[PDB]
Ligand binder design. Sequence first.
Ligand SMILES: [K+]
Ligand SMILES: [K+]
Ligand SMILES: [K+]
Ligand SMILES: [K+]
Lengths: 259, 259, 259, 259
Amino acid sequence: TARQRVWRAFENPHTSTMALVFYYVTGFFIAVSVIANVVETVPCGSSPGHIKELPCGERYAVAFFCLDTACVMIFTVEYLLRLAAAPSRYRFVRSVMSIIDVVAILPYYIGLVMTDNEDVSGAFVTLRVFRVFRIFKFSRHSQGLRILGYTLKSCASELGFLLFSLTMAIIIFATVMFYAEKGSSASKFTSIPAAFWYTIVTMTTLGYGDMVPKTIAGKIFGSICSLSGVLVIALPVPVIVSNFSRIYHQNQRADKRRA
Amino acid sequence: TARQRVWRAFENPHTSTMALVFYYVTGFFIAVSVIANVVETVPCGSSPGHIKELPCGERYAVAFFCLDTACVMIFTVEYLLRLAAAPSRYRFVRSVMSIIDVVAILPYYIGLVMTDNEDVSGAFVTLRVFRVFRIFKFSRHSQGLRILGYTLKSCASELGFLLFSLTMAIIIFATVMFYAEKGSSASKFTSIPAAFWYTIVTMTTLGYGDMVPKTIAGKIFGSICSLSGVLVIALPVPVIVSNFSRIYHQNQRADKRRA
Amino acid sequence: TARQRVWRAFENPHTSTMALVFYYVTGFFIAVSVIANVVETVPCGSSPGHIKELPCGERYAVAFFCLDTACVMIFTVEYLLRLAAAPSRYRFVRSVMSIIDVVAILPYYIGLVMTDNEDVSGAFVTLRVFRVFRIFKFSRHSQGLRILGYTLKSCASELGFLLFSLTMAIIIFATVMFYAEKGSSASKFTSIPAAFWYTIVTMTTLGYGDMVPKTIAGKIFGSICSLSGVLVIALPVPVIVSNFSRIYHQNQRADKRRA
Amino acid sequence: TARQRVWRAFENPHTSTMALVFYYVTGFFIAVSVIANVVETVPCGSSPGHIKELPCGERYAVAFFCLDTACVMIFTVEYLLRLAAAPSRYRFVRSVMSIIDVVAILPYYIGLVMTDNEDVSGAFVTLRVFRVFRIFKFSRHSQGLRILGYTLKSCASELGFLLFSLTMAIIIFATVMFYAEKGSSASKFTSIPAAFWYTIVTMTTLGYGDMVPKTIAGKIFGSICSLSGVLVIALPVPVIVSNFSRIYHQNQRADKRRA
Ligand SMILES: [K+]
Ligand SMILES: [K+]
Ligand SMILES: [K+]
Ligand SMILES: [K+]
């Protein structure tokens, strides 16, 4: 019963005070690691003996490294204990949660085994972009009433269909806008993939304004794209609202049929 | 009886006629204070002897000071009339509108007790900002503002967690976008907090365009971010309208139970 | 019965072939006058003997004036016949339709009585801005199933309330942004009315990008304003949808209870 | 029987297996043609002897011409197989998908009959634009595209009149905004059609910001225009979702009547 006790402590933290406090402690380290990751890019001032101000992640290299290694030791101990007290270890590993945990904790170890190649370029940048995966664990720790998740998986069909229609519309409008605008002077529409950016920014009603049409045909088709973008942003709202209300009432019905 | 008579004159001023008069007088004074606050920052111009065109609040500082102190005298006397006529002084003081009144009137007296050093900087700006909360006193003049407050109080936990998830998505997108765009030339994505601005502007479908991606990876993730903004537009609507409908329907049921 | 015949020809065009053709003819002149008004501002090319290319409204002054006077004679004859065949002439005049008709036809006559002051400035510009009022007549001629109008007048209460809340939010956010951003260099937030523009452009999720925050406090409050703008644009959709469906079903119910 | 056997193989290719094979082959060829069209505009670069980096469509024009003519040979033979196996040649030819097929394949043969003069300019761009309508042939591969087409055909008159009203509002706002902003310095509101661009960009809540108001009156009317864009976002949703629900519910009723 010891292994089942540790497991029921893990996926049901509220049962035991010690389980609850371990839950809150690992949540706190996830939060501090996320905040440290965000902070270690902020350029600290006073530029001590440097041509340009160094970010807090290079000026205080050892401090942020010690904080990172404390967080990663906590995460690794968590994952090892979960792998121990898992009833079906293979099924536990196959869960997307363990995948996220391992791909979040790996960057630290992979950087530690490449300290000799400290002058590496490009690869470590992606490696430590994957250090943003700890926010996923943090979102998991707030596993409140996920009516929104149920609504999203209820609407998944129409959302994927809208994504496919949006892809077709993006390709069509990008072709049209590129051919209308390839001939302008210093034109930003240098290719159809280049016009993909303008199209996706227009159909979402961003309009950054870096790429704008400069020709009458380009402006006509940009207007058509704008209207289709109005439709794009507007359509999901009523159906998401309806599905949310439906699942909400369904959950109260389930609660009452449990009483 | 005078205490409770004045109280009833206050919270149901439609019963009496002098109470309605005082109601409309204090509403007028609130409007006057708000309009004076807005206008006194407008550059009046045409001021000889000063190269910089002073605002109407410094060229005619005497008139605006007299107007604001008259408005705050009205607010102070009406607040003391509320307090003196309350059946329960503690309950009224703890009530949110009392906090609104006190946060509206305290800045003037704080400026009075600070005026010994007219060279105050950094604090007077905060006082001026808090001088706008006199507009919140219009809730007493609008059942719509009361029902909006009740709706927001109902949408407390769920909008809180929705904002938490939005913040988590902002952190994720800011991380990926900073690391995609830190290396560009004269880049504005100088840190992850710096890219917080781009992420929040994109996820809301503003697209100021002041800072836009310039790399292929940055543009791919900006496209994903805007597409997620399409869902950001629709996410709060279900729960906001559901809570509003709940409040409205219990109001209807209560009004029918009255009949 | 002659006057009632002319009236029933006017407000019920489909009855008589001659009534229908007069309806279509006056619709066609409204369309041609609108198109002429739009065109007479387009700068025609070839710049014949001019420092700068003249618009089609000054190069062909007589042609556009003759087209305008033909349209205005048709409109005046229409309005005179309506005033004749009106059963209650005073009530007919008091209708907003006759107000729009007279304020649309007046610009021509008022310009004709001020041809001596052909060098007038400013006033005639507004006078001929009111020449855009003919589009209102044109929209009237398409008096199809106005379920949208009924829905809008059904939602008028909540729409006005949302407008009032938007006004309060604009004033509050403008005060906050101006005080956060008055101190920047070459700042566009030179007053609270100046920040009205930024606020209204942000809460509607336009983000032109001419006025953007440049300070950390300004960016924080611009983010709050952006989120409130998401709420602003998102909220009307479900309620308009519900009201539209309700009135739609009500209209089919009315049609069937008429059968 | 061969005619009808092949026909059934075409419009219900799930029945057979060789029909499913030909189905997936032609879907693959449609995807290949679309991707080739997009890619061949991308500047390949690294081309010695040419200062301008040619697109992949001119550096490797032979490969892309062979690929496109192979795709169009497949399209031509499959179209002639549809036509030859149709029970009713006229009904099939008049059917919209036949128009899609012919408008997809005609540009290639028009280019073939134009190739005697390879210096064609202005027409070849139109042919290239119409070469994207091969993407529409994916409707045969998506029940979602068919139901979207049915919905749009249902939302024919009402969206038409909604677009008419939107155009009328665009004309009104463009008139007032041009006359508010014609007098500014280096103004981009050079005509009412010039302000059509600003009006459509603002009413859709894009706000590129390329052309923004610079006058107080221009800013007031731009605020009104954006506020109207808030309604523009919500206007088509009721009728679009109502018609979609009608189509979906009659589909459900038919499928139940099957059982
Ligand atoms: K928008
Ligand atoms: K912009
Ligand atoms: K926008
Ligand atoms: K924008």
